[PDB]
Write a protein that binds this DNA or RNA. Sequence first.
RNA 1: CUUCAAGGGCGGGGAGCCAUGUGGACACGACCCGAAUCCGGACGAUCUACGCAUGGACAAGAUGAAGCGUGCCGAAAGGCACGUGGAAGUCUGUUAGAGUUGGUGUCCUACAAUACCCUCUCGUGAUCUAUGUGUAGGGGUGAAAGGCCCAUCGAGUCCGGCA
RNA 2: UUGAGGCGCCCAAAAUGAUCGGGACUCAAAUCCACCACCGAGACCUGUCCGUACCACUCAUACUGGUAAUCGAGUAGAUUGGCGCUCUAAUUGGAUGGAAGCAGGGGCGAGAGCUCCUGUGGACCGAUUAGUGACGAAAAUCCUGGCCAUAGUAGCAGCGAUAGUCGGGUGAGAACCCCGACGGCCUAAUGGAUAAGGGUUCCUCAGCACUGCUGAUCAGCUGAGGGUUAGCCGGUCCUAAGUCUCACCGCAACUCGACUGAGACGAAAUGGGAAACAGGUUAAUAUUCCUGUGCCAUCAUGCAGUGAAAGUUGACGCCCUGGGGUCGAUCACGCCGGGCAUCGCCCGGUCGAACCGUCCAACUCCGUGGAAGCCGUAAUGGCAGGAAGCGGACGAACGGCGGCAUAGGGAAACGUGAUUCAACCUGGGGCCCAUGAAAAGACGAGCAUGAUGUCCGUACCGAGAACCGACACAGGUGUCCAUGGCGGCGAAAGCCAAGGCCUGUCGGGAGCAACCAACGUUAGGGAAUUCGGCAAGUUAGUCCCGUACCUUCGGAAGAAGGGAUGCCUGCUCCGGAACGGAGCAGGUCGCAGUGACUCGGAAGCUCGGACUGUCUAGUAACAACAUAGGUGACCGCAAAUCCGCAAGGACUCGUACGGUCACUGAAUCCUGCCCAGUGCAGGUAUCUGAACACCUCGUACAAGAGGACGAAGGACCUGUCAACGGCGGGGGUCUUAAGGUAGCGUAGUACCUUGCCGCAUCAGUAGCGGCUUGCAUGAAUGGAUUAACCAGAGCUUCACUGUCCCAACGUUGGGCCCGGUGAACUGUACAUUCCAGUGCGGAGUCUGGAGACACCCAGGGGGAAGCGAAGACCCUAUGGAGCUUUACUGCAGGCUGUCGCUGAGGACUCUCACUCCGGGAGGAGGACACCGAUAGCCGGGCAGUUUGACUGGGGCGGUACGCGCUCGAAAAGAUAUCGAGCGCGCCCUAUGGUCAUCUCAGCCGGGGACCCGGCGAAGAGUGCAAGAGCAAAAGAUGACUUGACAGUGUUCUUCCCAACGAGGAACGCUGACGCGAAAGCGUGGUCUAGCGAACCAAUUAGCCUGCUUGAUGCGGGCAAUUGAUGACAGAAAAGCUACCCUAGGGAUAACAGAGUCGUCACUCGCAAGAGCACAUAUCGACCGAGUGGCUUGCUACCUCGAUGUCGGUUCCCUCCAUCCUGCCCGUGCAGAAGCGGGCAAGGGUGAGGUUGUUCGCCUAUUAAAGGAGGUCGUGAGCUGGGUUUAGACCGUCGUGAGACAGGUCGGCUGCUAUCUACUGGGUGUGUAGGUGUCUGACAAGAACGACCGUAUAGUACGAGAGGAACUACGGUUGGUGGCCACUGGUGUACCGGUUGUUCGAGAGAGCACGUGCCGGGUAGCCA
Length: 237
Amino acid sequence: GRRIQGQRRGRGTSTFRAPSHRYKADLEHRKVEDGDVIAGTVVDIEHDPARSAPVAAVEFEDGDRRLILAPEGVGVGDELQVGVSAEIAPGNTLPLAEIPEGVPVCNVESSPGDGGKFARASGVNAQLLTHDRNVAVVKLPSGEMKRLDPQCRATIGVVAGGGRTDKPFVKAGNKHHKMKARGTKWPNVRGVAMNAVDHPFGGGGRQHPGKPKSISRNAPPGRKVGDIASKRTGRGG
RNA sequence: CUUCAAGGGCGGGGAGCCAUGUGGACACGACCCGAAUCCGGACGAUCUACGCAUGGACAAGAUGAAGCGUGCCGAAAGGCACGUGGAAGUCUGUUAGAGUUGGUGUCCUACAAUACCCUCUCGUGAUCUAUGUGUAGGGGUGAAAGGCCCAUCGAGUCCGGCA
RNA sequence: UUGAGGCGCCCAAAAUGAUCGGGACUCAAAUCCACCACCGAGACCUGUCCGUACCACUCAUACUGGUAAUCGAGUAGAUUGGCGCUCUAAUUGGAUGGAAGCAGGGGCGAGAGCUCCUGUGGACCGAUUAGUGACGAAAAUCCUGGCCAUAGUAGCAGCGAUAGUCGGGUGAGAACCCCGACGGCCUAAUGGAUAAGGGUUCCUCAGCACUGCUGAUCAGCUGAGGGUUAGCCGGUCCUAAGUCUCACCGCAACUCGACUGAGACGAAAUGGGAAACAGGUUAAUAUUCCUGUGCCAUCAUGCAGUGAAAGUUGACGCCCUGGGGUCGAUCACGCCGGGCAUCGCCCGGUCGAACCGUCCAACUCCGUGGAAGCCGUAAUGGCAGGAAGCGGACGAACGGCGGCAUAGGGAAACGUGAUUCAACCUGGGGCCCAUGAAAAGACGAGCAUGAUGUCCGUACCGAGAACCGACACAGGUGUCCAUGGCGGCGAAAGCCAAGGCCUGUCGGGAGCAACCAACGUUAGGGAAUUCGGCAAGUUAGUCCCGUACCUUCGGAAGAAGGGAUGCCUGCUCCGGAACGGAGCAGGUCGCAGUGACUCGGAAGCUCGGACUGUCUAGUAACAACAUAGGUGACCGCAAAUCCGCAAGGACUCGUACGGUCACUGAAUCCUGCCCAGUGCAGGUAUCUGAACACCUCGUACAAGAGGACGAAGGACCUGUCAACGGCGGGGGUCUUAAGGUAGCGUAGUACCUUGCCGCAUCAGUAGCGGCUUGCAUGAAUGGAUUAACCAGAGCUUCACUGUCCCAACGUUGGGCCCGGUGAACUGUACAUUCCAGUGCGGAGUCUGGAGACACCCAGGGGGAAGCGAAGACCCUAUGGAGCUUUACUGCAGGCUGUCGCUGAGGACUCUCACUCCGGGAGGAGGACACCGAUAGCCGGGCAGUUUGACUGGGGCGGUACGCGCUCGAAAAGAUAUCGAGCGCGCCCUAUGGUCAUCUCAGCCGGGGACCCGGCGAAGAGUGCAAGAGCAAAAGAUGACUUGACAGUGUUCUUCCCAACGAGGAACGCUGACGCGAAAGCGUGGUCUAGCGAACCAAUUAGCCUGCUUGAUGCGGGCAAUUGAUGACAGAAAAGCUACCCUAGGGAUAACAGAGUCGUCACUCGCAAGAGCACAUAUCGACCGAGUGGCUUGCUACCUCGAUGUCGGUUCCCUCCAUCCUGCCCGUGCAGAAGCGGGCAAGGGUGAGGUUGUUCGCCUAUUAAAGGAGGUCGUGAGCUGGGUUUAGACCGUCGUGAGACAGGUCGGCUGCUAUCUACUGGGUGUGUAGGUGUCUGACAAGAACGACCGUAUAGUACGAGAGGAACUACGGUUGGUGGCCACUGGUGUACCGGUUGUUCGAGAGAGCACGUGCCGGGUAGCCA
Ligand SMILES: COC(=O)[C@@]12OC[C@]34[C@H]([C@@H](O)[C@@H]1O)[C@@]1(C)CC(=O)C(O)=C(C)[C@@H]1C[C@H]3OC(=O)[C@H](OC(=O)/C=C(\C)C(C)C)[C@@H]24
Ligand SMILES: [Cl-]
Ligand SMILES: [Cl-]
Ligand SMILES: [Cl-]
Ligand SMILES: [Cl-]
Ligand SMILES: [K+]
Ligand SMILES: [Mg+2]
Ligand SMILES: [Mg+2]
Ligand SMILES: [Mg+2]
Ligand SMILES: [Mg+2]
Ligand SMILES: [Mg+2]
Ligand SMILES: [Mg+2]
Ligand SMILES: [Mg+2]
Ligand SMILES: [Mg+2]
Ligand SMILES: [Mg+2]
Ligand SMILES: [Mg+2]
Ligand SMILES: [Mg+2]
Ligand SMILES: [Mg+2]
Ligand SMILES: [Mg+2]
Ligand SMILES: [Mg+2]
Ligand SMILES: [Mg+2]
Ligand SMILES: [Mg+2]
Ligand SMILES: [Mg+2]
Ligand SMILES: [Mg+2]
Ligand SMILES: [Mg+2]
Ligand SMILES: [Mg+2]
Ligand SMILES: [Mg+2]
Ligand SMILES: [Mg+2]
Ligand SMILES: [Mg+2]
Ligand SMILES: [Mg+2]
Ligand SMILES: [Mg+2]
Ligand SMILES: [Mg+2]
Ligand SMILES: [Mg+2]
Ligand SMILES: [Mg+2]
Ligand SMILES: [Mg+2]
Ligand SMILES: [Mg+2]
Ligand SMILES: [Mg+2]
Ligand SMILES: [Mg+2]
Ligand SMILES: [Mg+2]
Ligand SMILES: [Mg+2]
Ligand SMILES: [Mg+2]
Ligand SMILES: [Mg+2]
Ligand SMILES: [Mg+2]
Ligand SMILES: [Mg+2]
Ligand SMILES: [Mg+2]
Ligand SMILES: [Mg+2]
Ligand SMILES: [Mg+2]
Ligand SMILES: [Mg+2]
Ligand SMILES: [Mg+2]
Ligand SMILES: [Mg+2]
Ligand SMILES: [Mg+2]
Ligand SMILES: [Mg+2]
Ligand SMILES: [Mg+2]
Ligand SMILES: [Mg+2]
Ligand SMILES: [Mg+2]
Ligand SMILES: [Mg+2]
Ligand code: NA
Ligand code: NA
Ligand code: NA
Ligand code: NA
Ligand code: NA
Ligand code: NA
Ligand code: NA
Ligand code: NA
Ligand code: NA
Ligand code: NA
Ligand code: NA
Ligand code: NA
Ligand code: NA
Ligand code: NA
Ligand code: NA
Ligand code: NA
Ligand code: NA
Ligand code: NA
Ligand code: NA
Ligand code: NA
Ligand code: NA
Ligand code: NA
Ligand code: NA
Ligand SMILES: [Sr+2]
Ligand SMILES: [Sr+2]
Ligand SMILES: [Sr+2]
Ligand SMILES: [Sr+2]
Ligand SMILES: [Sr+2]
Ligand SMILES: [Sr+2]
Ligand SMILES: [Sr+2]
Ligand SMILES: [Sr+2]
Ligand SMILES: [Sr+2]
Ligand SMILES: [Sr+2]
Ligand SMILES: [Sr+2]
Ligand SMILES: [Sr+2]
Ligand SMILES: [Sr+2]
Ligand SMILES: [Sr+2]
Ligand SMILES: [Sr+2]
Ligand SMILES: [Sr+2]
Ligand SMILES: [Sr+2]
Ligand SMILES: [Sr+2]
Ligand SMILES: [Sr+2]
Ligand SMILES: [Sr+2]
Ligand SMILES: [Sr+2]
Ligand SMILES: [Sr+2]
Ligand SMILES: [Sr+2]
Ligand SMILES: [Sr+2]
Ligand SMILES: [Sr+2]
Ligand SMILES: [Sr+2]
Ligand SMILES: [Sr+2]
Ligand SMILES: [Sr+2]
Ligand SMILES: [Sr+2]
Ligand SMILES: [Sr+2]
Ligand SMILES: [Sr+2]
Ligand SMILES: [Sr+2]
Ligand SMILES: [Sr+2]
Ligand SMILES: [Sr+2]
Ligand SMILES: [Sr+2]
Ligand SMILES: [Sr+2]
Ligand SMILES: [Sr+2]
Ligand SMILES: [Sr+2]
Ligand SMILES: [Sr+2]
Ligand SMILES: [Sr+2]
Ligand SMILES: [Sr+2]
Ligand SMILES: [Sr+2]
Ligand SMILES: [Sr+2]
Ligand SMILES: [Sr+2]
Ligand SMILES: [Sr+2]
Ligand SMILES: [Sr+2]
Ligand SMILES: [Sr+2]
Ligand SMILES: [Sr+2]
Ligand SMILES: [Sr+2]
Ligand SMILES: [Sr+2]
Ligand SMILES: [Sr+2]
Ligand SMILES: [Sr+2]
Ligand SMILES: [Sr+2]
Ligand SMILES: [Sr+2]
């Protein structure tokens, strides 16, 4: 047949790419040697085209203008501290060791000094639970207990822009606009509505899949469609 | 040669070798033309699909969302009236522009290898559009019709494989 | 009275014109019995000649003689002699006293062909012999070129742009070249400036051979000259999506490839950007030249200045809105000029830039001030954290103001105020799950004077003739002018300026016919039309009143329905005002006041999809795609998913409120049951599970064999259906897990089926409601429901109408005639046909007849199975391609073990390789991971292929695909069909072999076991089909035995004849045996079925052999046994295609024709039976005999290089088996009305409701509303509703692609007539100069058909009820021909009214599509 849509994706053509040239900043944490004497004042609160959540413009003590991931409640004029012995205030970045247990945290690092990987979407938060000299157990937004290094930096508080998923898109045009700002080809034509040549579920006199939808993990790209390695399907049982 | 044995098979009392013509056979293009393929390397996004960059376009009218206001009633929460406001993949619209339902009209050696006329649809949006730019052939692109990729597509075009 | 024979008669119906070939024939020109004489082949006889064969003579196949009664046709094909062409060679010739070639002509040869003469030509040409070969054409939808008919034919008309006319000019020539006048056309374009693209097309002069839809003196044509001038307009510079180069790395390699660096490129209308305005000038340039004035940058000098870089700018989305404000437009008034002349109105102008200077609203801010309720807006809003008010800092226009300007421009005047105000300036508000460039540059940061400011573009077109589309193409092609006037809501219509044009480039003529394209008007009726209101029409703008069901409360809604609408006089209200809006009173005209133009028809029921949106560029716009919403799945990021061979990369400036992979498809109510199969995932004691390493055997080693351990995977267990999917049969469980819950239901799903009931209609296969056992409904394969929406499917009502009854008249362009220009399709030939026949069964050409004087014009298209396309349907080919899958075989990819990288101390620690994070220090991880290699599993993701044959086409079914028997089979042998009956793919250690003894079925008699006797040629038994063989046996019993043995042949069979393997049989020999006294019998079973190649393996016995050589291992071979190919003389092998493609076939199907006629229709014979009695008024079984060619079927003759489908329609002819009408006979005939029958085809046989229907059902009329043929008449006539392409849905089936003789929505209709045919019109010739009048061979007719009513008559008849006829009248209906006094239509003749706009008003006119609209309408033509 012909290569399926998921195969055209990896080629990285214009249609499947993200409008990077229209994106503001790659939100990473500031690189401090040691100490704490790094503080800044929030100049502006901007809209980030990349994640739909707001982003805070901060100017530091050493005169560095960089955008940072905005938590809830952080406004213009406010002072945020970054360092080891930073004040345990919402919006401050300090390693997981220094942050007390049972406190909601965002922009958590994987390997210490990477700039933040986990809990970065609108209104989400990671929960810090257990402490040790070796490990800091953080409960990520998916409900998974991630065992992390205590030297991994994290910003205190939940991410701003919460409850975005609550209000519906209502009309196709609103989805259109959102998708034109992301790295996604939209709209989605069902495989079952295509020809046999185009997709494993294409063909027939009526629209139904050919074989069962639950595909094996070992399936090759071109065949791996539908329910990928499903442990189960349905709602009941 | 096979064989206790027997019986069988093949060969045996000197004609061949070479040359020229000619009949016929096999491989090769194989008396000549005749078709849909398959494969290789190249040339195409001046058409068209989808994306991107930078620009441009949308008479006039209708309907009157939220919010705000004033008056009245109420302890209050509020409610009602009027006004204000001017929302909308909103309506009418041959505005510009886009599209193409019916006539199965005209044309059908055409004006035209997709045209003409009337009728019809959309027309502030998932809108239309110019230019620049990207994606290339078992690959693109596809709101999916096997649609489109320069009058070429259930696998483009050119030349080669090839007689 | 009865029998037999001969000929004839009845029985006896078919479609364009009857037939024995025709004429025609009757003591024959018939038939039968005899007879006589003739005609009539290429046969037969005969003269001569020829070829061939043979004989004699001969070197001869050279002559000559002879023989053929026993030689003389021939496709494919075998054999043989010869003709002609090119060039070579030897030998030998011809030619300027005329070669070859060509044209016409003479002679020879059976012929291929040879040769001569005359003319032409003007330089080469032969012959014989031996060679050479790019050596011979009527054909291939053959190739190239040329040419004819077609034909002086089509086109030069059709487009909302209908364009011209009269004079004159120039010229050899003028409809179209130029001037004037008159008349028109274009208004977002037909005007102005440009981008791209073109490329000299621009200007001048000279031209007409080319080009130009005719002509041309003209030109975008031909030729020659000429023409594009820049510091300040673009390029140039900057950066955008992004591109390239270099380096680096990959790659076998590169002109290849991703990342990372560096550099460069990347914007001419339309991103950013230092600077120019006014006028004049040329045939052609112009912010470029010239005049005037101005500005920018750099640099030099001089003065100033020490500031200098922070900041600002460049620099930015969509929606609403205020303020400032120019041009324009309009109003007032004044001046200048023009126009008009019943008025005094109308038009044009009244100018003046860049720049320099100056003014500043908005915003922001400061001082003052002191609001507790005030300030403020179009709106939001603002404030003791300090409102209003007052003063102030900062600060805008492409704007005002002054200069510029005793510049420029104007014939002149050379204005002033106003309103609305594009540009431009500056603010306020709102929206985003959308957040709306960058860089160079500028500012920040003065002034003089002088210098420099190079390079590239610059013409013209920019389109119904300069671009793309082969064209001077009705197509396509971006930007700015969006503010010219009236009009009106308007960038709308209509009209008109400025400007442009008469080049959407052939004309002239005919009241101008038919016919066609566009269109106007049609009385009465009003959808009767049609699949369907298709087409057309109706409605319409604005204000007032008023407005249902339902609803998601938004909507429905402009629901529906009703009223109003002009002009004139004078006014009121809102507002600063408008040349803005809203109203009032009085008067007044028309048929009509949104008077033209512009401008919705309305309502209801149902199906689908919720909605806006998307789509098959070019037959599908839809119910299909998308969508929000719903849901499931995967993944913590060193992720999941995806791309790359690699280096690397998308997602990702992303992180679960994420984004990947799928399904369902808004909201609302819901979404049952099943985990057996399949799929996915988890688990797993045990079983199974590869390679490496390890152990055993083996080999001096190795191959090799076995074991041990055992990963993923599998077995097994569990989870899971919003995962593929399933939800029945039976009974009061069974398959295979469950056994259909809510709902919905004759559905776009229901076969039956037009289901039943109801609604509605005269009538309703439709539609809607209800019922509903549902062939075969049903829950995210989503069920139900639903307001709103729709160029979606169906139905009903009101309104409207030429859709129809039923057609008419008119308008414009064609059409017809003339001038000019000038194709194409098509063509084997011949061709004046017609009716029949025949023929490969569908003939202009054959046969027989009939008809037919030639030529030409116009026509509509009957025929040429017309022209167009090597049929898409169907089959076939060891054809192709796309697609599917649990087809065959493989290839990527994923998972997993093992080896290398890889290190220290069956579970563990470490750090040093290696990986990742961190800028770094250092941190995480770590011998793992990555990578290289190998092994096992999964693996249509991808590739190559296969998927047979037979067959009354193919599929399905079957196997007549290898074998045996009987019959078919025609008394030797051979013999077919999907011919009839039926078998074999073994079985047996005895059921084989021999010998001895013996005789069986069945029956009878004596004591179904057993015993004795008799009869008993064979019916018993003999393994199994059938046919055949057998009695001291081939059967039975008994005993002994293993010949069912080894080896090698002969022959027949397999395969008649007649080649062919395996297999088989009969018959021998050699060896060894068994039995018997012996002869002898035993090469399996009495005979005919019970079977298998090569390659490879295993097995048996002996031997041969392996590369210099010996030993060992392991191999190669001679002979033979076993293992299977049943498609059985042997491939390892599944499907779909409607997305399709090719080669062919009428070798083969679908239509139709043709044959047949079982079927169908009709008839006839006999006449049981009943009809109260009565066969025969009427009905009529069984059986028998037929005719037709309307049904169906059969066959495969005709066509697959195409004979267009069903139904319908329109128009013509016919048949009779007669429905009516006429004339008749019978009656169970009183009458009336009927029933049955006969003759008869003249005429008629109609309108409607459902359905595509044919058919049929139904309604009302009727004299009756008959049937059938003409290629199921009729698509070069129409329609396109059904069938039957490509799109889609439902049900069913399928794992799937996809299918269905199921349903459903959508889905294209080519061509200029050569021949023939006919309808009409002419010109010639014949009869043989004229005028007028006739005749009538023949030809056509339906010219007429039918009904009702009155008198007869309430009469005959009949108890009555009821109720006729002859005849005479009047009318109606259908058809026919003609005519227009009358009625009616038309009447773009004409007259009137009136809306808009333009000519100033008036008068009088143009335009509004070929009349703006409305009213009336003569002639004519018409019903
Ligand atoms: C121009 O068309 C033809 O001539 C055809 O003749 C009648 C016909 C055919 C063919 O004869 C022939 O090809 C049938 C008569 C042949 C037949 O056997 C059969 O069963 C049917 C169904 C035919 C009817 C008609 O069918 C056409 O498709 C077929 O039409 C076509 O095949 C095609 C046409 C009109 C064009 C698309 C080429 C007809
Ligand atoms: Cl999303
Ligand atoms: Cl000869
Ligand atoms: Cl330019
Ligand atoms: Cl404001
Ligand atoms: K045919
Ligand atoms: Mg980041
Ligand atoms: Mg996008
Ligand atoms: Mg979808
Ligand atoms: Mg499809
Ligand atoms: Mg596939
Ligand atoms: Mg579906
Ligand atoms: Mg489905
Ligand atoms: Mg382009
Ligand atoms: Mg309002
Ligand atoms: Mg399809
Ligand atoms: Mg010689
Ligand atoms: Mg020749
Ligand atoms: Mg020939
Ligand atoms: Mg002609
Ligand atoms: Mg005109
Ligand atoms: Mg000239
Ligand atoms: Mg032209
Ligand atoms: Mg009428
Ligand atoms: Mg219509
Ligand atoms: Mg007032
Ligand atoms: Mg229906
Ligand atoms: Mg829709
Ligand atoms: Mg289409
Ligand atoms: Mg549509
Ligand atoms: Mg969804
Ligand atoms: Mg759908
Ligand atoms: Mg019904
Ligand atoms: Mg369910
Ligand atoms: Mg063919
Ligand atoms: Mg194939
Ligand atoms: Mg790294
Ligand atoms: Mg395949
Ligand atoms: Mg076959
Ligand atoms: Mg015989
Ligand atoms: Mg084999
Ligand atoms: Mg063996
Ligand atoms: Mg065979
Ligand atoms: Mg055989
Ligand atoms: Mg074909
Ligand atoms: Mg045939
Ligand atoms: Mg025909
Ligand atoms: Mg009769
Ligand atoms: Mg008749
Ligand atoms: Mg009808
Ligand atoms: Mg027919
Ligand atoms: Mg015809
Ligand atoms: Mg036709
Ligand atoms: Mg025609
Ligand atoms: Mg239909
Ligand atoms: Mg249909
Ligand atoms: Na091939
Ligand atoms: Na393109
Ligand atoms: Na309101
Ligand atoms: Na159209
Ligand atoms: Na290809
Ligand atoms: Na022959
Ligand atoms: Na002309
Ligand atoms: Na100024
Ligand atoms: Na819309
Ligand atoms: Na199951
Ligand atoms: Na079902
Ligand atoms: Na629509
Ligand atoms: Na008409
Ligand atoms: Na004809
Ligand atoms: Na194909
Ligand atoms: Na086969
Ligand atoms: Na044999
Ligand atoms: Na018959
Ligand atoms: Na028909
Ligand atoms: Na008759
Ligand atoms: Na026919
Ligand atoms: Na037809
Ligand atoms: Na047609
Ligand atoms: Sr980083
Ligand atoms: Sr990061
Ligand atoms: Sr499918
Ligand atoms: Sr459930
Ligand atoms: Sr392009
Ligand atoms: Sr508007
Ligand atoms: Sr149509
Ligand atoms: Sr036309
Ligand atoms: Sr066409
Ligand atoms: Sr029309
Ligand atoms: Sr509209
Ligand atoms: Sr809209
Ligand atoms: Sr070739
Ligand atoms: Sr008769
Ligand atoms: Sr002869
Ligand atoms: Sr002969
Ligand atoms: Sr030749
Ligand atoms: Sr030549
Ligand atoms: Sr010619
Ligand atoms: Sr004309
Ligand atoms: Sr122009
Ligand atoms: Sr001339
Ligand atoms: Sr010119
Ligand atoms: Sr550049
Ligand atoms: Sr520019
Ligand atoms: Sr204003
Ligand atoms: Sr045009
Ligand atoms: Sr067009
Ligand atoms: Sr004018
Ligand atoms: Sr012309
Ligand atoms: Sr009239
Ligand atoms: Sr109707
Ligand atoms: Sr009304
Ligand atoms: Sr399109
Ligand atoms: Sr729903
Ligand atoms: Sr299961
Ligand atoms: Sr039930
Ligand atoms: Sr004849
Ligand atoms: Sr004609
Ligand atoms: Sr058949
Ligand atoms: Sr025997
Ligand atoms: Sr199958
Ligand atoms: Sr289909
Ligand atoms: Sr009668
Ligand atoms: Sr009807
Ligand atoms: Sr029929
Ligand atoms: Sr029927
Ligand atoms: Sr007929
Ligand atoms: Sr149709
Ligand atoms: Sr049907
Ligand atoms: Sr069907
Ligand atoms: Sr004569
Ligand atoms: Sr009476
Ligand atoms: Sr007119």
